[PDB]
Amino acid sequence: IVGGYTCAANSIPYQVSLNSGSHFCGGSLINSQWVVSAAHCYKSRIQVRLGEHNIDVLEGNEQFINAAKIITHPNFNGNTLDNDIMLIKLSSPATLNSRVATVSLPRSCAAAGTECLISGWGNTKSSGSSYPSLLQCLKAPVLSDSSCKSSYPGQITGNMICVGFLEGGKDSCQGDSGGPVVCNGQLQGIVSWGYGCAQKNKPGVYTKVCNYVNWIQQTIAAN
Ligand SMILES: [Ca+2]
Ligand SMILES: [Mg+2]
């Protein structure tokens, strides 16, 4: 997250770290047994780390649980990034408490201008590279469909939204991929793509989760 602030410890209790020897992506706990993330984050082996604040220090509240199933959206396109969504089934259920909690799926799509919270352990520098120990947060609005589609001509599908700021300086980055955008208590976005991060007129693009509630629930029920 560029231009964010350090979240209060465990204040984002649905945020997970996906680990393959090191943190590589975020995700969101949406059921005791299931995490949702981005398909461009796929790896064949993943350890899910729940209840993290400092991903470099074992502070007590962590639950480390291996992925048992990793299911990318059948219509994921790695060129256009359409349907950039993936489900991970935990090998055992997360134990839900104040520091490890599910986030609701959308009840509807979000209005333009809705305030959201974006979080992750991705790159914090707008030049170079700095990968934080502590979870970072960013408040950002759902952008107008003038602002989003004008920023990426011909590239915003019906399954994408932009969330952020056209002036630059505030965005999600590499390593935030797969993490949450939560607006009014609902998971509306998954960190997906853009053009670098925090550049002028290149707001972050996010998978539009309000299109996927059927796919998510059908996958959960069948696995
Ligand atoms: Ca930790
Ligand atoms: Mg580090």
Tell me whether residue 177 is one of the annotated catalytic residues: yes
Q: In angstroms, rounded to a whole number, what is the distance separating the alpha carbons of residues 117 and 218?
A: 27
* Contact present, 15 and 181 (Cβ < 8 Å): no
Q: In angstroms, rounded to a whole number, what is the distance separating the alpha carbons of residues 61 and 159?
A: 35
Going by DSSP bridges, is the β-strand pair 115-120/136-141 parallel, antiparallel, or unpaired? antiparallel
* Contact present, 7 and 54 (Cβ < 8 Å): no
Q: Hey, which residues does 27 pair with through a beta bridge?
A: 16
Q: In angstroms, rounded to a whole number, what is the distance separating the alpha carbons of residues 55 and 57?
A: 6
**What strands, in cross-sheet order, belong to the sheet with 160-163?**
5-6, 136-141, 115-120, 180-183, 186-193, 204-208, 160-163
User: Any known ligand binding at 59?
Assistant: no
Q: How was this structure determined?
A: X-ray
**CATH 2.40.10.10 residue spans of the chain:** 1-12+103-210, 13-102+211-223
Active-site residue (options: 17, 172, 177, 192): 177
Q: In angstroms, rounded to a whole number, what is the distance separating the alpha carbons of residues 28 and 144?
A: 25
Rg of the chain in Å (alpha carbons): 16
Tell me which residues have their CB within 5 A of the ion that is ligand 1: 52, 54, 57, 59
Please give the structure tokens belonging to residue 83: 């349907």
The residue with tokens 């989003």 is 148
Listed in sequence order, the DSSP H helices in the chain are: 145-151, 213-222
Q: How far lies 184's CA from each of 44, 117, 121, 137, in Å? A: 33, 9, 22, 15
User: How is domain 13-102+211-223 classified at the CATH fold level?
Assistant: Thrombin, subunit H (2.40.10)
Active-site residue (options: 23, 40, 53, 73): 40
- CA 141 to the chain's CA centroid: 15
- CA 30 / ligand 1 centre spacing (Å): 21
Q: Which ligand is closest to the CA of 132, given by its number?
A: 2
User: Any known ligand binding at 167?
Assistant: no
Single-letter residue type at 24: F
Superfamily (CATH) of domain 1-12+103-210: Trypsin-like serine proteases (2.40.10.10)
Q: Could you give phi then psi for residue 191, rounded to 5 degrees? A: -55, 120
* Contact present, 205 and 161 (Cβ < 8 Å): yes
Active-site residue (options: 82, 84, 171, 176): 84
Resolution of the experimental structure, in angstroms: 1.2
Q: Hey, which residues does 72 pair with through a beta bridge?
A: 86
Exposure string of 153-177, with b = 16+ CB inside 10 Å and e = fewer, is eeebbebbbbbbbeebebbbbebbb
